[PDB]
């Protein structure tokens, strides 16, 4: 690791996982041995996916998440590095496994059977976050996971910001992606709050407009609540009460939507960190995420 | 060194294992209990077991330079296996697989990534000084090329006294017509339950009586049949059988057949009878079925 200029990086706190994806002509029968058509090892995870996109956009970025020493972590570290992501803030754990998932895709009907990673690895704690010099970062994005601990991390960034002049204040964003009650306390933190379509649907909201009007009461004074909704584009709502919307930019053919939301989050964060408006950031968010949907992986998203 | 090692020729795979409560339904999302990496492959699994049994052993298979091969090599060295005979390849990736182990019954479902890696050729085998080995086990794979390797061991044996002849074994694990030419080679022939079932045989007894005509004069045909144990049949025509040694809880059957093969090979290489080797084969394979991996077999 070397010298990182002050207020230059965008930090994404969250999960990194090794996704082993196998494409099969038919789903295997229990206790059987089949040969896959093609097999890939990928670095997944929301915060991890957003780092890749932030690097491709030309932003210096850093990742913070838990990892255990081993060959799985070595592959993920090398893949982060291949995408120019800074891994100096990784929380190296003595106990637990680096997350790894097995995804079996059936080529005959497109069905995906996923065997998710185990829960052995501890998440990043408030004490792990407390040891980080925050002066390198201009923006800190937190993927909602272990909410009680993340609230303390968010409280530490507020304490830091109270001592800085407006030009050296660290902007903050949070993602509520899974419909879990523990995560809803995170709505009240951050300057930008991303809520997923899946969370909105689980709370009874049938559109991005309903979600934003129904959830704005949970965000802190002055924050912007954002809700992406696939082919219906994305909406945003700020303190002025004006619902903002961007149409989607659907690709010529949809090839791969995995990490589309993470591409949208990184692109909105990037656009706002460059001083652009919320309306311009929604549009850019939809443009990059839309381009990504017509490509396999993140190469060529530009 | 002279006639001290047991050589296993075959595949070496990186097994990415997930241990689950129950096998997933298609299109479902489950959380595994745990995960681990194991050095797999039939011949490679048999080397692990042969080392744990106290046998000096060597592995021969194709590997491509890289981090996957480095992990597997370090594991072969951690398990005391000799890797000096590895056939290093300039193209193709090292094989890997996703193994889903069901903790409730020990079933193992494997999704194998069989790469563009070339197999060990008769030319690669021709460069090996065979004097170090007392036994050579060949996992059936590229049959045309392996028949030439087997023909070379016969030529070598013709020029040696009975005491210094290299004993040979073969495994026919996959139901492929190309592999059935290998029945006519080796002193011991292992045929899998899956192969026997594919040929219409509903038991180890039917398989052995129906397939003995394919083995060479004097050979022993062996057929393991999971919870039903294993059978063997030699030139005397007497069907031998061993009951299984099931653990109260069967938690991992990944590499059980390879444990049985290594244990039968080991017992026979120590001068024990076919009957004693079948029982030991089931004893060790049975103990393995109640443990995750190969630690605690001895
Ligand atoms: N089918 C699609 N066509 C065009 N753009 C899409 C499509 N799916 C996703 N996007 C883009 O990605 C953004 C986030 O998509 P979304 O489906 O809500 O997230 P995710 O699929 O990762 O859960 C959308 O706002 C849109 O800009
Ligand atoms: N369920 C089981 N209970 C007891 N022993 C077993 C069981 N499964 C396998 N074994 C032992 O392993 C040997 C090989 O069995 P096999 O079904 O071919 O395993 P694999 O599925 O790994 O190929 C059997 O002969 C037996 O000794
Ligand atoms: O459980 P089995 O049948 O004894 O064998 C396990 C096995 O060697 O199969 C290989 C694939 O052919 C490896 O993935 C695996 O370790």
Curated annotation (Swiss-Prot), chain B:
Homodimer. Requires potassium. Inhibition by ADP. GO terms for molecular function: ATP binding; fructose binding; identical protein binding; ketohexokinase activity; protein homodimerization activity. Coiled coil: none annotated. CDD domains: Ketohexokinase (cd01939). It is linked to Fructosuria: Benign defect of intermediary metabolism. Most abundant in liver, kidney, gut, spleen and pancreas. Low levels also found in adrenal, muscle, brain and eye. Beta-D-fructose binds at residues 15, 41-42, 45, 258. Its EC number is 2.7.1.3. One of its GO terms (biological process) is response to glucose. It comes from Homo sapiens. Keywords: ATP-binding, Carbohydrate metabolism, Disease variant, Kinase, Nucleotide-binding, Transferase. It catalyses: beta-D-fructose + ATP = beta-D-fructose 1-phosphate + ADP + H(+). Belongs to the carbohydrate kinase PfkB family. It comes from the Eukaryota. Catalyzes the phosphorylation of the ketose sugar fructose to fructose-1-phosphate. One of its GO terms (cellular component) is cytosol. Pfam families: PfkB (PF00294). Pathway: Carbohydrate metabolism; fructose metabolism. Gene3D superfamilies: 3.40.1190.20. InterPro entries: Ketohexokinase-related, KHK, PfkB_dom, Ribokinase-like. ATP binds at residues 108, 226-229, 255-258. This is Ketohexokinase.
């Amino acid at each position: 690791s070397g010298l990182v200029p002050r207020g230059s990086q965008i930090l994404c706190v969250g999960l990194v996982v090794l996704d082993v994806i196998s494409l099969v002509d038919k789903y295997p029968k229990e206790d059987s041995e089949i040969r896959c058509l093609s097999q890939r090892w990928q670095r997944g995870g929301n915060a991890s996916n957003s780092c890749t996109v932030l690097s491709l956009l030309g932003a210096p970025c850093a990742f913070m998440g838990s990892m255990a020493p081993g060959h799985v972590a070595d592959f993920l570290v090398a893949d982060f590095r291949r995408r120019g992501v800074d891994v100096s803030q990784v929380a190296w754990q003595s106990k637990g496994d680096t997350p790894s998932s097995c995804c079996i895709i059936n080529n005959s009907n497109g069905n995906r059977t996923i065997v998710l990673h185990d829960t052995s690895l501890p998440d990043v704690s408030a004490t792990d976050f407390e040891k980080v010099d925050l002066t390198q970062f201009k923006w800190i994005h937190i993927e909602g996971r272990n909410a009680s601990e993340q609230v303390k991390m968010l409280q530490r960034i507020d304490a830091h910001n109270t001592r800085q002049p407006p030009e050296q204040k660290i902007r903050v964003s949070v993602e509520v992606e899974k419909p879990r009650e523990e995560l809803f306390q995170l709505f009240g933190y951050g300057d930008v709050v991303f809520v997923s379509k899946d969370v909105a649907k689980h709370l009874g909201f049938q559109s991005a407009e309903e979600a934003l009007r129904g959830l704005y009461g949970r965000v802190r004074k002055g924050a912007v609540l954002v809700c992406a909704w696939a082919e219906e584009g994305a909406d945003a709502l700020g303190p002025d009460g004006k619902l903002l919307h961007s149409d989607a930019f659907p690709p010529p053919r949809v090839v791969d939507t995995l990490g589309a939301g993470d591409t949208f989050n990184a692109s909105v964060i990037f656009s706002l960190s460059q001083g652009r408006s919320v309306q311009e950031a929604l549009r850019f968010g939809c443009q990059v995420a839309g381009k990504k949907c017509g490509l396999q992986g993140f190469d060529g998203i530009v």
